[PDB]
Design an enzyme around this catalytic site. Structure first.
Site, PDB file in Angstrom:
ATOM      1  N   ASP A  25       0.940  -1.521  -0.213  1.00 38.90           N
ATOM      2  CA  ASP A  25      -0.386   0.014  -0.160  1.00 38.90           C
ATOM      3  C   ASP A  25       1.132   1.768   0.114  1.00 38.90           C
ATOM      4  O   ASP A  25       1.222   1.581   0.721  1.00 38.90           O
ATOM      5  CB  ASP A  25      -0.635  -0.375   1.259  1.00 38.90           C
ATOM      6  CG  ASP A  25      -1.902   1.140   1.488  1.00 38.90           C
ATOM      7  OD1 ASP A  25      -1.577   2.025   0.169  1.00 38.90           O
ATOM      8  OD2 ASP A  25      -2.928   1.011   2.254  1.00 38.90           O
ATOM      9  N   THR A  26       0.903   2.072  -0.833  1.00 36.71           N
ATOM     10  CA  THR A  26       1.702   3.818  -1.381  1.00 36.71           C
ATOM     11  C   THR A  26       0.578   4.267  -0.556  1.00 36.71           C
ATOM     12  O   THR A  26       1.492   5.363   0.173  1.00 36.71           O
ATOM     13  CB  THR A  26       1.776   3.245  -2.706  1.00 36.71           C
ATOM     14  OG1 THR A  26       0.031   4.099  -3.542  1.00 36.71           O
ATOM     15  CG2 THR A  26       2.218   2.275  -3.696  1.00 36.71           C
ATOM     16  N   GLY A  27      -0.252   4.235  -0.264  1.00 38.99           N
ATOM     17  CA  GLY A  27      -1.369   5.192   0.181  1.00 38.99           C
ATOM     18  C   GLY A  27      -0.731   5.161   1.807  1.00 38.99           C
ATOM     19  O   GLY A  27      -1.538   5.597   2.530  1.00 38.99           O
TER      20      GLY A  27
END
Ligand SMILES: CC(C)CN(C[C@@H](O)[C@H](Cc1ccccc1)NC(=O)O[C@H]1CCOC1)S(=O)(=O)c1ccc(N)cc1
Ligand SMILES: [Cl-]
Lengths: 99, 99
Positions: A25-27
């Site tokens: 997850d880049t978020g």
């Protein structure tokens, strides 16, 4: 490996002696794992997102094998619906977002 | 481009004639944006986040420019902490995760 996003980018991880599935997850600023026992001292923290906040235990300097790549860093343990591999560990394995 | 994750992967988006900041979020299935006025009828949708489920308004076939790349798809509007570009639109701009 080059991961397309037609589906959730799930991978197998190794933490505290157990095998688990987690989302790349880049978020997510930091990594968050479902309730489990980990060794060492921890401190409480609150993290928030869609739906509000949850209380987690912050463990530092934990080793994790992400898709066959070893990495060290902070792990948050708490009541999360999904295991999340955040940026704090994605950077260690040299992951980038390309387009 | 190739985006490293040492800091939040934020980008400019253009929607409804306005410029906004948005997070490239691989862990988000859908795209969720802060309250604003969008054209057309909306449908109700329930989405699950780290802190539970919330109600959002779904607008389809919205034109959105993500870091200069044009996309056209579903956009959800609701109480989100930051504008999020999820997998539905990342696949359209041909984004992948690499390591
Ligand atoms: C909201 C963003 C800014 C941050 N979240 C990351 C997001 O990728 C988050 C990951 C997730 C997926 C499925 C269930 C639960 C969480 N997806 C998310 O909410 O998906 C919604 C929006 C559209 O589709 C469903 S976080 O989980 O709140 C978070 C906050 C702090 C830390 N340290 C780690 C994680
Ligand atoms: Cl780097």
């Amino acid at each position: 490996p080059q991961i397309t996003l037609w589906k959730r980018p799930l991978v197998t991880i190794k933490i505290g002696g157990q095998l688990k599935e987690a989302l790349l997850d880049t978020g997510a600023d930091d990594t968050v794992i479902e309730e489990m026992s980990l060794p060492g001292r921890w401190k409480p923290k609150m993290i928030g997102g869609i739906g509000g906040f949850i209380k987690v235990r912050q463990y530092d300097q934990i080793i994790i094998e992400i898709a066959g790549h070893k990495a060290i860093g902070t792990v948050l343990v708490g009541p999360t619906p999904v295991n999340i591999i955040g940026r704090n560990l994605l950077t260690q394995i040299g992951a980038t977002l390309n387009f």
